[PDB]
Amino acid sequence: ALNLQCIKVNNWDLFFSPSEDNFTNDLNKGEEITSDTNIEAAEENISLDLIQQYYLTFNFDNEPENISIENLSSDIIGQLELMPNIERFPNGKKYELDKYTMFHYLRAQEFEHGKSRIALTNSVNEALLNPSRVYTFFSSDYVKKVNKATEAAMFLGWVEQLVYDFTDETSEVSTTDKIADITIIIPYIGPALNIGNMLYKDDFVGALIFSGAVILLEFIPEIAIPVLGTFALVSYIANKVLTVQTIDNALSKRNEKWDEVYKYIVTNWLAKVNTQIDLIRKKMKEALENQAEATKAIINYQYNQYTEEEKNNINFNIDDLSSKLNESINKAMININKFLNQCSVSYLMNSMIPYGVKRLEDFDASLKDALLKYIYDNRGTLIGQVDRLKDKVNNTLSTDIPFQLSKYVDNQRLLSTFTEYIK
Amino acid sequence: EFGSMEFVNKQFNYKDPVNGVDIAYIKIPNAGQMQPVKAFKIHNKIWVIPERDTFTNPEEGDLNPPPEAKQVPVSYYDSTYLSTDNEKDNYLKGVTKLFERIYSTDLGRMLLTSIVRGIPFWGGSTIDTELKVIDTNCINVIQPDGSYRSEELNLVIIGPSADIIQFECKSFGHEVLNLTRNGYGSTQYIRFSPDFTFGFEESLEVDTNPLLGAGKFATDPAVTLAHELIHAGHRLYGIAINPNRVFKVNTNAYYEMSGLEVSFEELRTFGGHDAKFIDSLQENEFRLYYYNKFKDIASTLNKAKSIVGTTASLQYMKNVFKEKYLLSEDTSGKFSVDKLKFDKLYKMLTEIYTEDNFVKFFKVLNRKTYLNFDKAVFKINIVPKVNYTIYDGFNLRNTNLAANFNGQNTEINNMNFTKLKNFTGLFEFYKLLCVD
Ligand SMILES: [Cl-]
Ligand SMILES: [Cl-]
Ligand SMILES: [Zn+2]
């Protein structure tokens, strides 16, 4: 690699990506159930309602008094809390890529809102080279019209059509049910951030339907669920009550186990996946704004080229133009956020949760044989009700416990995405 | 404009004559010797020092940009800021207004009350049968006649150090004890300014607000302060997570941040998704840990036979801490830690008081993650009621700024935000991405 085209990417515009170390768990840890096994009650989620209950059981009156203390030395000697020393992060690190990145594509859509008023939209990343050429993922027809020198007599009409053209380009949306959990698809995202390195709405929609949401991720998160620890049971010969308590604890304990695995996966999904989708939706918003600015730049330049005819003949108001393009950006984002919400949840449900459920099913199978054997070996101690218990065990360990996102997440816009998903 | 004479029932003017009670020159814990600074007592246990912080940290006296920048997204410097009486008067009024705004919400009322009761433990005795205060949890209030008297306090709001928009919680410690992490708690000093705020970008309200403004939105100063008060709350109850526990990130790949390191304590404080990045195994580790610390305090209270340094009885002081830690006691007077009560108190300080829940009560636009880094810094003036209110912040009702958080929109509400130069270059910290 002799020659290089390089761009400086601000540290804060880069991807998060937690270390696998931050995620620990003792799921593989075994356990022994006894008639005294402590059962963890259900941890009620935080909500305006819970906060309400806390507010009521709250004492506001009588604060501790300002009691008098004996004078200290006129100079109180103290030293602030240590505070760990963080090694300065390495800077300026260079990278040589075999592909244009999200950052290049995004950088390509920029220009200096300075004086240089001769910006020209175009469809190649060689707008990265020329500071007067801005890249656009919009159709080639759009570039032709926006770049075209326009007569003062046709300015307003020209603009009006660009506003509409702009909305048409950004309001673009595709539908399908060939992806599962993802019904809509915004095809221009592909050529906007070069997702998957293809830069063709066309290829994009295809890739997505083929392999799913994984296509968007900057890195495939890792998530494993070891073989779950199994339960050992203590029998209490001739002691029905204790024997029963053990069986109920083993059961209630299985529910906690499913909850534990579910919650763990949500923590991982939330930190490794959802974060990546969030940055992507932030970048889409950046791209859209870049486009609006470039177009406004070009349009305003045209207007300044006129001569006092701008007076009556035109009377242009760039603020109104900016306002309209902004509404289009918002409409666009509403779609994008919907699509990204689906991608995120889809990845959780199809590429992550499944791994835990299988581990949990293996576990249920084991616990079941165990408990039924237990009941049998103690049929003498439980004489009064083996069937009642057998039925209970069979009924409980035969059905997987439903994964309910609201049980772990509060973001209402993600919960509805889940509800919609359920159907 | 209501709720004005409520949490802070004093119409302080910076130039008002000192009285040694709520308006006085004071001295705080310090390395060498500091000159008295004029301070104000806005509420029981809470003071405000309208001065740039050039005394809490000996290595921080210069108010000019450091040699090395400061690996932060945004930073601002101006050694001239907070040096005139007018500036200090406006700062005092700004900090006060933010308190009223925070206090006017239910959550705010709760957190402010929890802070006042969060009196740092009297654990300075080397003789376990005696309760003694820890001197670094006090200040000296100089009287008009030049004499002085010492006083305990839980919170102090001071001006920022060199980096004007670097807000944080600072507290003094003991030689052997870790006050912010052992349940004892310690007086908190918060570097803060109501005169500047951050700019961030929204990518999501829309759906609900299709007419959402265009540019950057300004963080509501009240949220920022409440954020610091949450840290303060943790520290006052000695349950802040050790700063060493941080969310390590990978940085080798070209697409990864060159560095970050956000602490667990930080994720905890923000709330929302962020706090859920912490697995349950570690969350239970923390809770068990602090529960044991609380039991230690309980034992220490039961070992106390006498109290030193005050006319306040040993009984009063024990009750003060019974209430703060919500301990139980028998008819015999024995103190103990109730698991249920500990759990509620711990959940309330840790999961109820969060930046995100405050956003809910304030109903303003705000970053949805700690990871949505600020991109700009603005100058503001929240004191005039026509610019900002205790009830609506920037989004004034019965105004064109009432809907769609227009008030928080930099371009729309441009008369309220002046963009300042960020002192952390766009390319100070970065990665060079090259293509052949
Ligand atoms: Cl007001
Ligand atoms: Cl003003
Ligand atoms: Zn913080």
Side-chain angles (χ1 to χ4, degrees), chain B residues 140-167:
Chain B
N140 289 322
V141 184
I142 305 180
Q143 304 299 300
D145 72 14
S147 64
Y148 76 86
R149 61 189 178 71
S150 301
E151 190 173 306
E152 322 174 74
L153 72 179
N154 306 347
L155 179 71
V156 178
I157 308 304
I158 50 177
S161 189
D163 179 2
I164 294 179
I165 65 184
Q166 174 209 282
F167 310 145

Tab-separated table of all heavy atoms in Angstrom, chain B residues 140-167:
chain	number	residue	atom	x	y	z
B	140	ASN	N	-15.212	25.674	59.112
B	140	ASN	CA	-15.125	26.680	60.157
B	140	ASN	C	-15.837	27.898	59.617
B	140	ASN	O	-15.502	28.394	58.545
B	140	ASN	CB	-13.673	27.027	60.500
B	140	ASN	CG	-12.974	25.905	61.228
B	140	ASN	OD1	-13.578	25.227	62.063
B	140	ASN	ND2	-11.695	25.702	60.928
B	141	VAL	N	-16.844	28.353	60.355
B	141	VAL	CA	-17.625	29.513	59.981
B	141	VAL	C	-17.053	30.705	60.742
B	141	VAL	O	-17.158	30.782	61.974
B	141	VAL	CB	-19.103	29.309	60.363
B	141	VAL	CG1	-19.954	30.480	59.873
B	141	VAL	CG2	-19.596	28.001	59.786
B	142	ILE	N	-16.441	31.633	60.016
B	142	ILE	CA	-15.861	32.794	60.662
B	142	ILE	C	-16.929	33.817	60.970
B	142	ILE	O	-17.734	34.181	60.113
B	142	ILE	CB	-14.792	33.461	59.794
B	142	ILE	CG1	-13.726	32.433	59.395
B	142	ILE	CG2	-14.166	34.625	60.570
B	142	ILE	CD1	-12.637	33.017	58.537
B	143	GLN	N	-16.921	34.288	62.205
B	143	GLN	CA	-17.891	35.257	62.664
B	143	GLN	C	-17.497	36.672	62.305
B	143	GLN	O	-16.367	36.933	61.910
B	143	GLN	CB	-18.030	35.130	64.171
B	143	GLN	CG	-18.395	33.734	64.592
B	143	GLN	CD	-19.724	33.314	64.020
B	143	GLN	OE1	-20.749	33.938	64.291
B	143	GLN	NE2	-19.718	32.258	63.217
B	144	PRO	N	-18.446	37.605	62.411
B	144	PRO	CA	-18.184	39.012	62.101
B	144	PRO	C	-17.047	39.586	62.949
B	144	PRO	O	-16.244	40.381	62.462
B	144	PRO	CB	-19.519	39.679	62.406
B	144	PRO	CG	-20.501	38.628	61.986
B	144	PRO	CD	-19.894	37.354	62.543
B	145	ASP	N	-16.978	39.172	64.213
B	145	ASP	CA	-15.951	39.661	65.136
B	145	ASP	C	-14.581	39.009	64.944
B	145	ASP	O	-13.663	39.250	65.729
B	145	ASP	CB	-16.398	39.442	66.579
B	145	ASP	CG	-16.355	37.986	66.986
B	145	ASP	OD1	-15.746	37.173	66.261
B	145	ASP	OD2	-16.929	37.650	68.040
B	146	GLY	N	-14.447	38.169	63.924
B	146	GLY	CA	-13.168	37.531	63.685
B	146	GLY	C	-12.967	36.211	64.396
B	146	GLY	O	-11.987	35.507	64.138
B	147	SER	N	-13.867	35.872	65.310
B	147	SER	CA	-13.763	34.602	66.014
B	147	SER	C	-14.356	33.579	65.065
B	147	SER	O	-14.712	33.920	63.945
B	147	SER	CB	-14.584	34.632	67.301
B	147	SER	OG	-15.966	34.786	67.021
B	148	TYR	N	-14.483	32.331	65.497
B	148	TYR	CA	-15.065	31.319	64.625
B	148	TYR	C	-15.628	30.139	65.391
B	148	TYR	O	-15.389	29.993	66.586
B	148	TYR	CB	-14.024	30.819	63.619
B	148	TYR	CG	-13.003	29.861	64.187
B	148	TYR	CD1	-13.261	28.490	64.246
B	148	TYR	CD2	-11.766	30.322	64.658
B	148	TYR	CE1	-12.314	27.597	64.758
B	148	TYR	CE2	-10.816	29.444	65.169
B	148	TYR	CZ	-11.093	28.082	65.217
B	148	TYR	OH	-10.156	27.200	65.726
B	149	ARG	N	-16.392	29.306	64.692
B	149	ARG	CA	-16.956	28.098	65.276
B	149	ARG	C	-17.041	27.052	64.171
B	149	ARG	O	-17.220	27.385	62.998
B	149	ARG	CB	-18.339	28.362	65.885
B	149	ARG	CG	-19.375	28.829	64.898
B	149	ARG	CD	-20.659	29.279	65.573
B	149	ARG	NE	-21.608	29.754	64.571
B	149	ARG	CZ	-22.239	28.960	63.714
B	149	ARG	NH1	-22.040	27.647	63.748
B	149	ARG	NH2	-23.036	29.483	62.793
B	150	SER	N	-16.886	25.789	64.552
B	150	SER	CA	-16.930	24.688	63.607
B	150	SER	C	-18.350	24.176	63.434
B	150	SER	O	-19.169	24.261	64.350
B	150	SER	CB	-16.007	23.573	64.084
B	150	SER	OG	-14.686	24.065	64.205
B	151	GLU	N	-18.637	23.637	62.255
B	151	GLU	CA	-19.973	23.144	61.953
B	151	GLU	C	-19.942	21.966	60.982
B	151	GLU	O	-19.110	21.916	60.078
B	151	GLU	CB	-20.798	24.294	61.365
B	151	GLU	CG	-22.263	23.997	61.231
B	151	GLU	CD	-23.059	25.210	60.797
B	151	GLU	OE1	-22.944	26.253	61.475
B	151	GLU	OE2	-23.802	25.122	59.792
B	152	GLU	N	-20.844	21.008	61.173
B	152	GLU	CA	-20.896	19.859	60.277
B	152	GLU	C	-21.800	20.244	59.115
B	152	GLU	O	-22.685	21.086	59.263
B	152	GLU	CB	-21.505	18.630	60.958
B	152	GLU	CG	-21.158	18.414	62.402
B	152	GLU	CD	-21.937	17.247	62.999
B	152	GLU	OE1	-21.603	16.083	62.688
B	152	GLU	OE2	-22.897	17.495	63.766
B	153	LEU	N	-21.571	19.624	57.965
B	153	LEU	CA	-22.376	19.870	56.775
B	153	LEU	C	-22.249	18.636	55.885
B	153	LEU	O	-21.284	17.869	56.006
B	153	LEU	CB	-21.899	21.131	56.036
B	153	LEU	CG	-20.580	21.141	55.254
B	153	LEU	CD1	-20.417	22.521	54.628
B	153	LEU	CD2	-19.380	20.801	56.156
B	154	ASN	N	-23.220	18.429	55.005
B	154	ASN	CA	-23.181	17.257	54.142
B	154	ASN	C	-22.856	17.599	52.698
B	154	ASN	O	-22.319	16.774	51.964
B	154	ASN	CB	-24.531	16.527	54.157
B	154	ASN	CG	-25.000	16.163	55.559
B	154	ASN	OD1	-24.243	16.221	56.517
B	154	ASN	ND2	-26.259	15.772	55.671
B	155	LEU	N	-23.150	18.827	52.300
B	155	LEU	CA	-22.968	19.192	50.915
B	155	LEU	C	-22.520	20.622	50.662
B	155	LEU	O	-22.991	21.561	51.307
B	155	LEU	CB	-24.296	18.928	50.184
B	155	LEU	CG	-24.492	19.209	48.689
B	155	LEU	CD1	-23.706	18.200	47.863
B	155	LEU	CD2	-25.976	19.126	48.350
B	156	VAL	N	-21.608	20.776	49.708
B	156	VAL	CA	-21.118	22.091	49.316
B	156	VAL	C	-21.037	22.163	47.798
B	156	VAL	O	-20.480	21.278	47.149
B	156	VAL	CB	-19.713	22.401	49.879
B	156	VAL	CG1	-19.244	23.763	49.379
B	156	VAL	CG2	-19.746	22.389	51.386
B	157	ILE	N	-21.603	23.225	47.249
B	157	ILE	CA	-21.595	23.462	45.820
B	157	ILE	C	-20.608	24.600	45.579
B	157	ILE	O	-20.806	25.716	46.054
B	157	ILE	CB	-23.008	23.889	45.321
B	157	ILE	CG1	-24.063	22.875	45.787
B	157	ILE	CG2	-23.006	24.036	43.800
B	157	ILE	CD1	-23.797	21.448	45.365
B	158	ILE	N	-19.537	24.311	44.854
B	158	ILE	CA	-18.518	25.316	44.560
B	158	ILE	C	-18.368	25.493	43.059
B	158	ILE	O	-18.792	24.641	42.294
B	158	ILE	CB	-17.135	24.895	45.101
B	158	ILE	CG1	-16.822	23.475	44.640
B	158	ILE	CG2	-17.106	24.978	46.601
B	158	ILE	CD1	-15.462	22.994	45.051
B	159	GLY	N	-17.742	26.595	42.653
B	159	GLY	CA	-17.522	26.843	41.242
B	159	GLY	C	-16.571	25.806	40.658
B	159	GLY	O	-15.905	25.076	41.399
B	160	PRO	N	-16.491	25.701	39.328
B	160	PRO	CA	-15.589	24.721	38.733
B	160	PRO	C	-14.114	25.100	38.837
B	160	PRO	O	-13.765	26.247	39.118
B	160	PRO	CB	-16.062	24.667	37.282
B	160	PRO	CG	-16.473	26.061	37.028
B	160	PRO	CD	-17.264	26.393	38.282
B	161	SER	N	-13.261	24.112	38.606
B	161	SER	CA	-11.821	24.307	38.618
B	161	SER	C	-11.436	24.872	37.235
B	161	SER	O	-12.218	25.602	36.617
B	161	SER	CB	-11.126	22.964	38.883
B	161	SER	OG	-9.737	23.134	39.100
B	162	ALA	N	-10.253	24.530	36.735
B	162	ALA	CA	-9.815	25.047	35.434
B	162	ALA	C	-10.803	24.758	34.273
B	162	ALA	O	-11.257	25.688	33.591
B	162	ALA	CB	-8.420	24.518	35.112
B	163	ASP	N	-11.117	23.483	34.043
B	163	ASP	CA	-12.074	23.091	33.002
B	163	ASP	C	-13.455	23.462	33.551
B	163	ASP	O	-14.035	22.722	34.347
B	163	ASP	CB	-11.989	21.576	32.749
B	163	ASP	CG	-12.974	21.084	31.677
B	163	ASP	OD1	-13.712	21.911	31.081
B	163	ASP	OD2	-12.999	19.853	31.433
B	164	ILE	N	-13.965	24.610	33.120
B	164	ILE	CA	-15.248	25.130	33.574
B	164	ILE	C	-16.459	24.191	33.510
B	164	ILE	O	-17.394	24.338	34.293
B	164	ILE	CB	-15.597	26.429	32.815
B	164	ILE	CG1	-14.600	27.527	33.191
B	164	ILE	CG2	-17.040	26.863	33.121
B	164	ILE	CD1	-14.838	28.839	32.467
B	165	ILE	N	-16.465	23.238	32.588
B	165	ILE	CA	-17.607	22.347	32.505
B	165	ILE	C	-17.305	20.920	32.923
B	165	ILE	O	-17.925	19.970	32.446
B	165	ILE	CB	-18.247	22.378	31.103
B	165	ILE	CG1	-17.278	21.838	30.054
B	165	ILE	CG2	-18.663	23.801	30.781
B	165	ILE	CD1	-17.798	21.918	28.626
B	166	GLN	N	-16.333	20.782	33.818
B	166	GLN	CA	-15.982	19.484	34.372
B	166	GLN	C	-16.626	19.497	35.768
B	166	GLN	O	-16.101	20.110	36.695
B	166	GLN	CB	-14.469	19.334	34.492
B	166	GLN	CG	-14.040	18.062	35.201
B	166	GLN	CD	-12.707	18.226	35.926
B	166	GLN	OE1	-11.636	18.196	35.309
B	166	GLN	NE2	-12.772	18.424	37.250
B	167	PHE	N	-17.784	18.850	35.896
B	167	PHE	CA	-18.512	18.802	37.160
B	167	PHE	C	-18.273	17.473	37.828
B	167	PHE	O	-18.290	16.441	37.179
B	167	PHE	CB	-20.009	19.001	36.922
B	167	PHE	CG	-20.334	20.199	36.068
B	167	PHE	CD1	-21.404	20.164	35.174
B	167	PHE	CD2	-19.572	21.369	36.160
B	167	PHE	CE1	-21.710	21.272	34.386
B	167	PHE	CE2	-19.865	22.482	35.380
B	167	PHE	CZ	-20.936	22.437	34.489
